[PDB]
Scaffold this active site. Structure first.
Site, short mmCIF file in Angstrom:
data_model
loop_
_atom_site.label_atom_id
_atom_site.label_comp_id
_atom_site.label_asym_id
_atom_site.label_seq_id
_atom_site.Cartn_x
_atom_site.Cartn_y
_atom_site.Cartn_z
N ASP A 49 0.79 -1.28 -0.09
CA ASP A 49 -0.04 0.18 0.03
C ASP A 49 0.90 1.19 -0.06
OD1 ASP A 49 0.69 -0.85 2.89
OD2 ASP A 49 0.01 1.13 3.00
N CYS A 73 -11.75 -29.60 5.33
CA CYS A 73 -10.76 -28.71 5.25
C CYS A 73 -9.31 -29.39 5.18
CB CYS A 73 -10.57 -27.83 6.36
SG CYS A 73 -9.42 -26.69 6.44
N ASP A 103 -8.81 -8.04 0.28
CA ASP A 103 -7.96 -7.99 1.29
C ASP A 103 -8.80 -7.99 2.67
OD1 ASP A 103 -7.43 -5.41 2.99
OD2 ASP A 103 -7.20 -4.79 1.10
N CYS A 109 -6.42 -28.06 5.26
CA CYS A 109 -5.12 -27.46 6.02
C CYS A 109 -4.74 -28.41 6.91
CB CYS A 109 -5.92 -26.18 6.68
SG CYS A 109 -6.15 -26.54 8.43
N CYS A 120 -6.50 -29.09 10.28
CA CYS A 120 -7.78 -30.18 10.29
C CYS A 120 -7.21 -31.62 9.78
CB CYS A 120 -8.71 -29.59 9.22
SG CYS A 120 -9.59 -28.19 9.94
N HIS A 126 -5.57 -22.42 9.55
CA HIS A 126 -6.96 -23.15 9.30
C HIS A 126 -7.76 -21.88 8.67
CE1 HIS A 126 -10.90 -24.48 9.29
NE2 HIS A 126 -11.33 -23.32 9.81
ZN LIG Z 1 -8.61 -26.57 8.69
#
Ligand SMILES: [Zn+2]
Ligand SMILES: Nc1nc2[nH]cc(CN[C@H]3C=C[C@H](O)[C@@H]3O)c2c(=O)[nH]1
Ligand SMILES: [Zn+2]
Lengths: 366, 389
Positions: free
Chosen positions: B95, B304, B269, B306, B309, B335
């Site tokens: 920015d 999920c 964002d 990730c 998880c 996550h």
């Molecule tokens: Zn997750």
């Protein structure tokens, strides 16, 4: 099953088998963990570190307060914390944060986690282990003897050892778990030999050499070698509170096989990186120092860890100054990698008969 | 003889404004619509470059004000730019350095010369001109750089709104003149004008006369009503070029994201819920510090991908939030970023497969239930582009 390969100058080179039936090199160290994790590391980031020990150390002090949830979970602590493929030795105390002393009696020992004191009789101790289900666990013991107080440390620990053995014999869960006997007696030579020779009478899977932490006197080192002389050869020898590299080597010369790896964690927590060389002809640097703000070299030239291969001293310095946890991650990766590499060098030096030279190389940097 | 376009459209929804595209950026092509996490949020929580890449992130934000303080622009120069400093191989968006994460206690009044920073205890002030903002972002070497704008809160009224809007146009022109290497970094304009439809309309008409590679939508998400929020977003996308990207700043709530994709936005964002123990899920969030999770041995979300998880239970996260909070916050942040990236990946897959309306209906049904329980503004925003629930 501990099978040796050689005993060069009193140093035991070998491997432990039948663990499944996995294996552990000796002399070696155990992966240090706090409240069910290698500090600042995950499964993914740990997979990149080279030479990770086969067995990981857990502490009762960090897990005891989670007894209820773990008993409900039923499947043991390894599965609960998400790394069930690993071997776990559960010790009584954390070597870095042992908690207040003076709460050992002939009837209970107390540990401190995040919250409050967890007081444990033999029943409670064994009930907690039934929920943890570690592969090895330290038997309940009195290690606070530091003359008449040393006689008690042995007898209480003998009393705890036999009660725990009884309860294990009738616990289906703890059948596949290995108890480690604990040698006590403090600084009184007579009791150390007694604890050594009497604990060996019982069918424990290994021995823990307790109360040899530094502040490591050469007096204690004499007790150590005298104690290991009373211990059988085919059983592993662990020690607690001894992790600095020079102390490790002194204990290896006296028959000790397995070590805690809390030293690289302590280095990490003070923002430092291990740099001592352990192969050829200062042991750490403090990345908070201003001299690293523009230093675009890795922590250690030639290091293979993810931090050194991909990040600079400058970047880690900045991360410490802004208190980003990535600093602790990258320092832990390097420090564990460096420390496990150090142990690899010990086993290689024993194979080649050069441990005396490696000791001088280490000791000129410490 | 316009400049080369950095975006291509790969698919469009026939009813709504949803677009699926690609941004051809110097550190790789980015599929849109895209959610852009703040890179320092991840590293502050101990997330590595490898882990963030593994989650699918291909562009992340750098905060110019913070980087300008530590380590400072000169040191980032010696480090070969922000990519080299942090060892990030994908794209970076920075920015202007005059607003984001700058405390109001640190700012004096804006003048035509630029933004003015105050130093502690009656010390001397520092100027950030549009020219110096571009030069700082040239040194950071990010792939997308933002104009210096005069930002006023969305709930301010009076002449200041128009004043700041026009100064933003003038600072745009000065940033364009200062940016000598558009072959290396892409400068984006920022639409202002508050909640005033005439002012924002004017800002849209005038800023799109400048041939910059992309346009951001500023001034929103600052406490205005939802009724006004979505109408300003839709006003903006109705006048921003279709063949360039639309970047909506400061929108990260899942429902807001899905609606604003439907209104024609491409990049997003937003700044943090993991600190309270909240885990983002398709029905909203889970507050894992609640006692009900103490013995909940299932993962946050079995679907999920990730690392949290696939490795850990709610019960274990609940224990760590109490016993080792730093570690829990790493797991929750991993996550929560995964959830945002998977939401936008799933949004994008629905547009390519020409089933975005059905995806929105499934999303709203899972998130809220019957049409009557969905937020009234979202129902109306979605109905304005032909998506009925
Ligand atoms: Zn997750
Ligand atoms: N430079 C710049 N950065 C930005 N980040 C986020 C926004 C948009 N939302 C902020 C602006 C006004 C609102 O009160 C809100 O606080 C933005 C901008 O309008 N300009
Ligand atoms: Zn390294």
């Amino acid at each position: 099953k501990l099978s040796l390969i050689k005993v060069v100058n009193g140093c035991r080179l070998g491997k432990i088998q039948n663990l499944g039936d996995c294996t552990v090199d000796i002399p070696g160290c155990l992966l240090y963990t706090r409240t069910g994790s290698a500090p600042h590391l995950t499964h993914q980031t740990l997979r990149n570190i080279h030479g990770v020990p086969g067995i990981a150390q857990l502490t009762l002090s960090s897990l005891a307060e989670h007894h209820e949830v773990l008993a409900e979970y039923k499947k043991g602590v390894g599965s609960f914390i998400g790394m069930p493929e690993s071997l776990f030795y559960c010790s009584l105390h954390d070597p870095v944060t042992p908690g207040p002393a003076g709460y050992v009696t002939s009837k209970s020992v107390s540990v401190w986690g995040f919250g409050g004191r967890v007081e444990m009789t033999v029943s409670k101790f064994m009930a907690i282990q039934e929920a943890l289900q570690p592969d090895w666990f330290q038997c309940l013991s009195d290690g606070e003897a530091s003359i008449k107080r040393a006689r008690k440390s042995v007898d209480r620990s003998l009393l705890f050892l036999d009660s725990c053995l009884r309860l294990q014999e009738e616990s289906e869960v703890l059948q596949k778990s290995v108890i480690i006997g604990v040698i006590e007696g403090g600084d009184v030579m007579e009791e150390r030999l007694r604890s050594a020779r009497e604990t060996a009478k019982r069918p424990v899977g290994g021995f823990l050499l307790d109360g040899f932490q530094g502040d490591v006197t050469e007096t204690r080192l004499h007790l150590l070698s005298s104690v290991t002389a009373e211990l059988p050869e085919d059983k592993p020898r662990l020690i607690c509170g001894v992790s600095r590299p020079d102390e490790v080597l002194e204990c290896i010369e006296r028959g000790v096989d397995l070590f805690e790896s809390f030293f690289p964690y302590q280095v990490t927590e003070r923002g430092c990186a291990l740099t001592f060389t352990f192969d050829c002809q200062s042991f750490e640097i403090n990345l908070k120092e201003k001299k690293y703000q523009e230093d675009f070299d890795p922590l250690v030239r030639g290091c293979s860890c993810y931090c050194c291969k991909n990040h600079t001293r400058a970047y880690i310095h900045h991360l410490l100054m802004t208190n980003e946890l990535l600093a602790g991650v990258l320092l832990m990766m390097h420090n564990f990698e460096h420390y496990f590499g150090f142990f690899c060098s010990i086993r290689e030096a024993l194979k080649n008969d050069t441990l005396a030279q490696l000791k001088e190389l280490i000791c000129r940097q410490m | 003889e316009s400049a080369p376009r950095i975006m291509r459209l790969v698919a469009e929804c026939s009813r709504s404004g949803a677009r699926a595209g690609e941004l051809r950026l110097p550190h790789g092509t980015v599929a849109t619509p895209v959610f852009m996490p703040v890179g320092t949020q991840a590293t502050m929580k101990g997330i590595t470059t490898e882990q963030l890449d593994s989650l699918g992130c291909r562009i992340c934000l750098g905060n110019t004000y913070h980087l300008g303080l530590r380590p400072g622009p000169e040191l980032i120069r010696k480090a070969q730019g922000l990519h080299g400093f942090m060892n990030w191989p994908h794209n970076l968006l920075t920015d202007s350095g005059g607003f984001q994460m700058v405390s109001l206690f640190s700012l004096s009044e804006v003048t035509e010369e630029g933004v003015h920073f105050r130093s502690p205890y009656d010390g001397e002030e520092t100027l950030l001109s549009p020219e110096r903002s571009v030069e700082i972002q040239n040194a950071l070497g990010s792939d997308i750089i933002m104009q210096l704008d005069h930002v006023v809160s969305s709930t301010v009224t009076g002449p200041l709104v128009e004043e700041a809007m026009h100064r933003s146009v003038r600072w745009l022109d000065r940033c364009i003149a200062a940016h000598k290497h558009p072959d290396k970094q892409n400068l984006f304009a920022i639409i202002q004008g508050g909640l005033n439809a005439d002012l924002r309309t004017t800002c849209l008409k005038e800023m799109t006369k400048r041939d910059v590679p992309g346009f951001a939508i500023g001034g929103l998400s600052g406490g205005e009503s939802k009724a006004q929020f979505w109408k300003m977003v839709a006003l903006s996308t109705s006048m921003l070029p279709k063949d360039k990207p639309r970047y909506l700043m400061g929108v990260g709530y899942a429902t807001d994201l899905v609606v604003c994709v439907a209104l024609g936005c491409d990049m997003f964002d937003c700044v943090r819920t993991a600190r309270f123990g909240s885990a983002l899920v398709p029905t909203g969030n889970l507050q894992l510090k609640k006692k009900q999770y103490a013995k909940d041995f299932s993962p946050i979300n079995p679907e999920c991908p990730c690392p949290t998880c696939q490795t850990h239970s709610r019960a274990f996260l609940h224990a760590l939030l109490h016993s080792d909070n730093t570690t829990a916050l790493h797991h929750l942040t991993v996550h929560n970023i995964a959830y945002q990236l998977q939401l936008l990946s799933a949004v994008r897959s629905s547009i390519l497969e020409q089933r975005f309306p059905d995806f929105v209906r499934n999303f709203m049904r899972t998130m809220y239930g019957d049409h009557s329980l969905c937020p009234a503004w979202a129902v109306e925003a979605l109905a304005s582009v032909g998506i009925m629930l």
